[PDB]
Amino acid sequence: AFMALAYSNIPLGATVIPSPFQVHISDEQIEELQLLVKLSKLAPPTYEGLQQDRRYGITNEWLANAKEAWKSFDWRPAESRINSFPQFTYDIEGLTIHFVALFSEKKDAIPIVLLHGWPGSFLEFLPVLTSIRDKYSPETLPYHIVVPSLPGYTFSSGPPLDVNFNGEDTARVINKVMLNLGFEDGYVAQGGDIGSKIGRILAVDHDACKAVHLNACYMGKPSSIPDTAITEEDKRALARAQWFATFGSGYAVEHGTRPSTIGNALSTSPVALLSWIGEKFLDWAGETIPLETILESVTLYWFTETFPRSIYHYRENFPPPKLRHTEDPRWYIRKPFGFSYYPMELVPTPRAWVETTGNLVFWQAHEKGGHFAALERPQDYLDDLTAFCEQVWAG
Amino acid sequence: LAYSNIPLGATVIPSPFQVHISDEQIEELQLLVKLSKLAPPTYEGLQQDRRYGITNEWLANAKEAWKSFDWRPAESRINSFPQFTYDIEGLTIHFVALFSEKKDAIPIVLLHGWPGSFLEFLPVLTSIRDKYSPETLPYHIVVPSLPGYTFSSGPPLDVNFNGEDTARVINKVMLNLGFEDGYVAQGGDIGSKIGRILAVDHDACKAVHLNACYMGKPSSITEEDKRALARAQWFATFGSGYAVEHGTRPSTIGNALSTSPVALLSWIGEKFLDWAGETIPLETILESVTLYWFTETFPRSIYHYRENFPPPKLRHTEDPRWYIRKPFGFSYYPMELVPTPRAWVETTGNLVFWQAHEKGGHFAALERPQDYLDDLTAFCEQVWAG
Ligand SMILES: [Cl-]
Ligand code: NA
C-alpha cells in the first residue's frame, strides 16, 4: 500500500527507484519465539558458569534472567519504532538489499553510508538517525543517510548459495546501492567492525566513495614503526588488544573455520543464539548495553535467520593472510581518511598505527565508549561524522 | 556378571552400577529433538567435503534418525559389562571393568577423551570377552569416566580443576582396586595427557602407551611423513576452533549447546566425521551424543581446554617436566589429528615400543578395536616387569 513517510523522497538523479519496505514479522513467528524460549533447556551449574566476572563467558545467572525477561519481551513496539524510519530494498546481483534511509530535499546534500558489523545490524544506528531527524527536517537536512543491511543480515538476502562471497563482493554490492540512488558523483562511508573493512574497500577500490571515516582499524603494531613510544592510554590499548587476541577470539576462529557447524548449532534454539551473541554485547561495550537492546537484536537475528548467513567474512583470515588487511599497501587509503578512537574498542589503535594505513586527515579521541560506538555514544558518533564530512567534502 | 569379581587386595570395594535412564529423560530428549529448528540453506552448509563444518543435510538426516533412535537396546548393551562407582574426593567416579581370575593379572587403565567416553572402549572390551574367559584373561581392564563425563560427577563448582587433578583422581581408582604395585595406562586425546601425567608423577603407574602425542616438530622425508605434516597443519589451521572456544569461553559454549540436543549434535557430530579414519556409523554418534545429553556432560567436560590459554612456554608433551622416563609405547594411526612420526615421539619419553598402522584415525579403539587390543597386549607383554 502507498505510505507517505517523511524523509523518504528518493534523490533526484537516482537511476533505480527502490521498493519501499516495512518490517512485518508474522504473528505465528512471535508466538513461536515465546514457546521456544520457554522450553529451551539451561545448562546445570558449573564452575565456569558461576564466574560472575564473565572470565569464561556469560554466566548461568545472566542467561536464566535473560530467558525470563525474553518470555515477556514484546516485539511489536520495537517493530513500530523501526518502521518510523524510511526503509527500502533494491535487487542487486540477485540479492535483496535492505536499507534504512533519511533523504534530504537538498539537491546537493552530502550522501553518507553507515556500515554495521557482527553481531550488529542497522539497529545500531537508529539512535543516531533519531538525533538527525530531531535536528533537521527533510528540508534542512545536510546529508543523505543510508544504513544498509549487509548481505546475509536481517532483511537482506543471501549471500548466494552457489559461490563464495567475500568483503570485496560486499563492498561492490553496497556501492551499487549508492550508485542506484544517484550518488556516482560521490559519497562518504563510515564503518566499524566488519563495516570498517567494507568501508576501507569502498574507499580504496570504488570511485564513488570519496572519503571514509572508521572507528575500528584492526591491526597489530605495524612493521613500519621501529619504536616503542608508550603512554598510559597506549598501555591500556595494547593490553586490551592482547586480551582480545588471546581470550576473545574464539568466535573468530569458529566462524572462520567451521561456519556451517556453528550456524547449524545456533539455529536450533533462540537461547543458543542468545548465549553466543549476548557475550559480545556484554564484553565489547564501554557503556553498558541494556538487556532490552540485546534481546531486540537477538530477536531480529532469530526472526530473519541471520546468524548462519552472517559469518562468511570471518573465513577470509584462514589461513592467516600474508599481510593483515589494514597493514597491506593494497588497502592503504589514499582518499581523505578519518578515525575516531574509542578506548573500549576490541583492538584500540593509537594514531601513529592508524596513520600507517592511510591518508589520515581527521583524528578524534574519546574518553567514553567502546566497540558499539554509534549505539553506545550516538551523539559523540554523530558529532564526529558530521565534523568529518564538513571538513573533507569538496562539493 | 562374568569378569566382575573384585581383585583380591582391593582396599575399597566399589559400588555396583547400572544405567537406568528414566522414561521422562528419554521423552524430554525426544521433545527437544522435535522442537529443534533447522538452519536456512547456506553456501557453507552445502559443501559436501565439509570444508566449513557439517552439512545442513547431514544434520537434518541425523535429527530425523534420532527420532527413531531407541536408547533401551544401547543401554542394555552398556549394562552387559561390569560397572561400578567410587567416591573419590567428593566425586562419583564411574568405571567399566573386566576383572581376571588370575591373581597377578596385569592391571590396565584405558583413558578416553573429548567428545568421547567409556563407550569408545566397549568394542575392545567385547573383543576381550570374545578372546578370553575370566580364567584366561591376562589383565584387569579399567575404563573410567573422567570427572565431568557421563556418569562421573564434577568437576567441582567452587574451585578450578585441571589435568593433574584428573590424573590424581583416576590414579586413586587404581589404588582403590589394589593396584598400588603397578598398572599400565593407555590414552588418546586428553587421555594421552592424563596418561603422561600418571606415568610421570604417580608411583603406581609403571608404563604408558599413547595413540596421540600432540606436539610440534622438534628442532632436532617419506610420503607418509608428508601426509602427516599436512594433516597436522590442517588441524592447527582449520580444526582447532573448538579448542579456542572451549579454552576461553567454556561457559558461553556450554550454555549455548545445552539448550537443544541438536545444537550438541551439530558440535560433536563434526568431530566424529572429521577425526575418524574408519567411518563411524550414525548410530554410534547418536549413542554418544544421547549419553552426553542425559548426563549433562558437555558443559562439565571442557575444563581441560583452558590449560593452554595463555599458551605455555613449552607444549606439555615437549616439556622436560613431563618427559616419560618409564617404559613408553606409541601407536601411529594415520588419521590422528596430529600424526607424529617416531623421531618426534622419541623426544618426549623413553620410547621402547612403536607400532604403525595403515588404517584408523583419532578414535583408534572405537575404529580399530582388534588393532588396538593387539597393540595393548604386545605392549604390556613387552614392558610389564611383575
Ligand atoms: Cl560504526
Ligand atoms: Na549498516
Q: Give me the resolution in angstroms, 1 decimal.
A: 1.5
Residue A195, SS3 per DSSP: helix
Distance CA B10, CA B142 (A): 13
Cβ within 8 Å of A, B 299-358: 299-300, 303, 306, 309-310
Alpha helices in chain B (DSSP H): 23-35, 56-67, 71-78, 122-131, 163-176, 190-201, 223-238, 241-248, 250-258, 261-274, 282-294, 297-301, 342-345, 364-367, 369-383
Residues 6+ apart with CB under 8 A from B96: B81, B82, B83, B118, B121, B122, B125, B142, B143
Q: CATH code at B163?
A: 3.40.50.1820
User: Minimal CA–CA distance to A43: which of B161, B63, B264, B165?
Assistant: B264
Q: Quick one: cell of B131?
A: 578372546
Phi and psi for B255 in degrees, rounded to 5?
-70, -40
CA-CA distances (angstroms) from residue A340 to A326, A348, A369, A383?
16, 10, 11, 11
Phi and psi for A259 in degrees, rounded to 5?
-60, -35
What positions of B carry a catalytic annotation? Answer: 189, 305, 362
Residues 6+ apart with CB under 8 A from A27: none
Please tell me the number of the ligand nearest to residue A100's CA: 2
Cβ pair B64, B36 in contact under 8 A: no
Residues 6+ apart with CB under 8 A from B238: A257, A258, A318, B51
Cβ pair B355, B333 in contact under 8 A: no
Cβ pair B298, B181 in contact under 8 A: no
User: Minimal CA–CA distance to A344: which of A300, A382, A380?
Assistant: A380
Cβ within 8 Å of B, A 277-296: 279
Cβ pair B121, B110 in contact under 8 A: yes
What is the DSSP code (8-state) at residue B349?
E
The half-sphere exposure of A331 on its side-chain side, counting CA atoms within 13 A, is: 19
Distance CA A172, CA A178 (A): 10
> Are residues A261 and B40, on separate chains, in Cβ contact within 8 Å?
no
Q: What is the dihedral of CA B344, B348, B354, B360, to 10 degrees?
A: -70
Give distance in angstroms: CA of B189 to centre of ligand 1.
43
Looking at the DSSP bridge assignments, the partners of residue B180 are none
Distance CA B129, CA B140 (A): 12
Instruction: Report which residue type is found at B384.
Output: W
CA A151-A157-A158 angle, to 5 degrees, is 65
Residues 6+ apart with CB under 8 A from A151: A95, A97, A157, A158, A159, A165, A169, A170, A173, A309
CA-CA distances (angstroms) from residue B323 to B183, B190, B196, B203?
19, 17, 8, 15
Does A49 touch chain B if contact means CB atoms closer than 8 Å?
Answer: yes
Whether A213 is a known active-site residue: answer no
CA-CA distances (angstroms) from residue B140 to B110, B177, B187?
11, 10, 16
Distance CA B142, CA A354 (A): 59
Shortest distance between the Cα of A280 and any Cα of chain B, in A, equals: 10
Q: Quick one: cell of A266?
A: 545456533
Cβ pair B288, B119 in contact under 8 A: yes
User: Minimal CA–CA distance to A345: which of A372, A314, A375?
Assistant: A372
What is the residue range of A140's domain? 1-395
Distance CA B179, CA B285 (A): 34
Q: Are strands A143-148 and A187-191 parallel, antiparallel or unpaired?
A: unpaired
Instruction: State the method.
Output: X-ray
Q: What are the strands of the beta sheet with B139-144, ordered from one edge?
A: B15-16, B83-88, B91-98, B139-144, B106-111, B183-187, B205-210, B324-332, B349-356
For every residue of A324-383, DSSP letters joined together read -GGGSGGG-EEEEEEEEE-TBSSS---HHHHHTTEEEEEEEE-SS-BS-HHHHSHHHHHH
Residues 6+ apart with CB under 8 A from B24: none
Q: Are strands A87-92 and A19-20 parallel, antiparallel or unpaired?
A: antiparallel
Burial class (CB in 10 A: 0-12, 13-18, 19+), B53: buried
Q: Quick one: cell of A265?
A: 548449532
Domain count, chain A: 1
Instruction: Report which residue type is found at B372.
Output: Y
Give distance in angstroms: CA of A98 to centre of ligand 2.
10
Q: Which of A246, A264, A279 sits opposite B266 (nearest CB)?
A: A264
Distance CA B187, CA B210 (A): 5
Burial class (CB in 10 A: 0-12, 13-18, 19+), A24: exposed
